Amino acid sequence: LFEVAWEVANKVGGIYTVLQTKAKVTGDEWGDNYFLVGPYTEQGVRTQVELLEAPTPALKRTLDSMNSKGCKVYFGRWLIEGGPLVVLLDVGASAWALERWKGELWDTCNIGVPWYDREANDAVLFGFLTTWFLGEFLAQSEEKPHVVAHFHEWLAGVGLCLCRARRLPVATIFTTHATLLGRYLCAGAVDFYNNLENFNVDKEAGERQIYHRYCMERAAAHCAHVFTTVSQITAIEAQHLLKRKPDIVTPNGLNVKKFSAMHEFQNLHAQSKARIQEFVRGHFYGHLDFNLDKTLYFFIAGRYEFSNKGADVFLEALARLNYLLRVNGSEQTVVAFFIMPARTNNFNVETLKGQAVRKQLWDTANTVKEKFGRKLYESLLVGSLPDMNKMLDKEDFTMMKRAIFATQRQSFPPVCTHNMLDDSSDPILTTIRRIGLFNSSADRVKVIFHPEFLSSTSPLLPVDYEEFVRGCHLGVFPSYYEPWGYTPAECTVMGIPSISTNLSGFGCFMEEHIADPSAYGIYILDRRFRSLDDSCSQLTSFLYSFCQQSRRQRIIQRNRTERLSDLLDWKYLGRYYMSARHMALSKAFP
Amino acid sequence: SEERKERWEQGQADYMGADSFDNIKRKLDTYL
Numbered sequence A: 001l002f003e004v005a006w007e008v009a010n011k012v013g014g015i016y017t018v019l020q021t022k023a024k025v026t027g028d029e030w031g032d033n034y035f036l037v038g039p040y041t042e043q044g045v046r047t048q049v050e051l052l053e054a055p056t057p058a059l060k061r062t063l064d065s066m067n068s069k070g071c072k073v074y075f076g077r078w079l080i081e082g083g084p085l086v087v088l089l090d091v092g093a094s095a096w097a098l099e100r101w102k103g104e105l106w107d108t109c110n111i112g113v114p115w116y117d118r119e120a121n122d123a124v125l126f127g128f129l130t131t132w133f134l135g136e137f138l139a140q141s142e143e144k145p146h147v148v149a150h151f152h153e154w155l156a157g158v159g160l161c162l163c164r165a166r167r168l169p170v171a172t173i174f175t176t177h178a179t180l181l182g183r184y185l186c187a188g189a190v191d192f193y194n195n196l197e198n199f200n201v202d203k204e205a206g207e208r209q210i211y212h213r214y215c216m217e218r219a220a221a222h223c224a225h226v227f228t229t230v231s232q233i234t235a236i237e238a239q240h241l242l243k244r245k246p247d248i249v250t251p252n253g254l255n256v257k258k259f260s261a262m263h264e265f266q267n268l269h270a271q272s273k274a275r276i277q278e279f280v281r282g283h284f285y286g287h288l289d290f291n292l293d294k295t296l297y298f299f300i301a302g303r304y305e306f307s308n309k310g311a312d313v314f315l316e317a318l319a320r321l322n323y324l325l326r327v328n329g330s331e332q333t334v335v336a337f338f339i340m341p342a343r344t345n346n347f348n349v350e351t352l353k354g355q356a357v358r359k360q361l362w363d364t365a366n367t368v369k370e371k372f373g374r375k376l377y378e379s380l381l382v383g384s385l386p387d388m389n390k391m392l393d394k395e396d397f398t399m400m401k402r403a404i405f406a407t408q409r410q411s412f413p414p415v416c417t418h419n420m421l422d423d424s425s426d427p428i429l430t431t432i433r434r435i436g437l438f439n440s441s442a443d444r445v446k447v448i449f450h451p452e453f454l455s456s457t458s459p460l461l462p463v464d465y466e467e468f469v470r471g472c473h474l475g476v477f478p479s480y481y482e483p484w485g486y487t488p489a490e491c492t493v494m495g496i497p498s499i500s501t502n503l504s505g506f507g508c509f510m511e512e513h514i515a516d517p518s519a520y521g522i523y524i525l526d527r528r529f530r531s532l533d534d535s536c537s538q539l540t541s542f543l544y545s546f547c548q549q550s551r552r553q554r555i556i557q558r559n560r561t562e563r564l565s566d567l568l569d570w571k572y573l574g575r576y577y578m579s580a581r582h583m584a585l586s587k588a589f590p
Numbered sequence B: 001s002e003e004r005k006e007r008w009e010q011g012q013a014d015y016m017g018a019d020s021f022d023n024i025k026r027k028l029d030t031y032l
């Protein structure tokens, strides 16, 4: 089997980890016949692949022919789990025959590529090199075995049709991840999911300069023996856009890091949450007037996309929840984190000041408690009891009093833990100001914006992304245009409830495999057949419902959501790949 | 076909002409 992908040497997308995790199961299935094809990169040979100068034990002549004919190729082992047998093909080794190749490419699949797009030319030459390698291999393989070709990415798939143009007896599988033109559709201020039946595809690809990319994407999809797509909604949009119904859906699987004990994922949540509290205390010095044992932590993560990630709907849902909580007379208060990496400079002076004040209060408490420990030790040694008539000392009260005096503050706490480069055009802050969330004492919803990836090297919040995710109570991911969705899957594996939509690939996948997806904590929405107001009202209702449960009910919900990690593991998702490969083999040669 | 060289060389990408996608469909379908 041959895996063809452009993300073997560079980590530009999530395909890298998907392939790395799938390599173990694919190798276990295919023995020593598992080969992977990828481009050669100067930056991806140092600590990314162990180059094997020795010839392949089952393949010696083709490498010699390829090297003698001018092109340069390398064999080796990918520095990932399992046993990978990877080949790296240089992009400049055969850069001297682009004109001849495109001259003989006119009659094959009739694709044209602009001369100023280096990436498209590199993909085209990669496809030519791959089809040449397959031709050489089958010529030198004595035609004894049968070769199956699997393609994961559209740049790497351009050569697939080339194989179909050479009458090569191989099984052709085309797998796509997302539509490139669909990404630009969502920014056109035109409804996309409710108009899926009518696309003027040719022109919208034309004037937007993405015509040829979609052209060979659709050519590869049509020419392939079998076509696969990541999720159900992505399959539907491919059918209504590429005019070809995918044979089967191929959701992405993720390896799960099991623990010795089932409940350990709870303990990792217990301590990590504490690390959050020490932060929020520091961010709320002089305004800590609410019980912190009755506080809920919500968060939304991922790339800084406003409409495509559902930040706005989450914001007005939280505003509605705040309005509702001020009429029910409840004491529950929620804190919402926005891990939205944006462009920022420096830190916020007030936030660091709050951290320093918290540390100073801790130091004062430590000194007073050490003095109390000394006095109590002496009294216990003499054989008495502390009557608290000497712990006053008439001196520690002075320092504690001036500490409390210093803690006093008049201005409101800030909403950002950084300093925005621009503030008149930042959507998040404009929406927050518009809806009226200023972290006031009378409010019941707090907003914390941290436009930076969480890392242990940061001065404030000394935790990475994984620990912070494990510390929260419920992740809200109201995705709008999300092909598959990795963050909700990661949260589900970690063992926390999540809120998703059927529009997202993960939500659609979960909705069609488990009945009644409400008792397991995966709160599904409906942004496809409902208006924005209905969706936000349903989200507010879900948020209130989550706020309604007790601690025991939350423990039940998290425990039940933990058991769903086995569903997303590759051990279960490999069945779809097996079915697709078997169907391709049957279609090619019985 | 010669007049179709430059149209896909520097990126004209004609779409209301006689070079639509179906013009590639009805000759690629013969490949299988």
Ligand SMILES: O=P(O)(O)OC[C@@H]1O[C@@H](O)[C@H](O)[C@H](O)[C@H]1O
Pocket (backbone or CB within 6 Å): A266, A267, A269, A270, A271, A550, A551, A554, A555
């Ligand atoms: O999940 P919570 O509602 O925040 O409960 C708080 C903590 O949750 C889990 O870590 C454990 O059950 C702890 O025993 C409990 O103290």
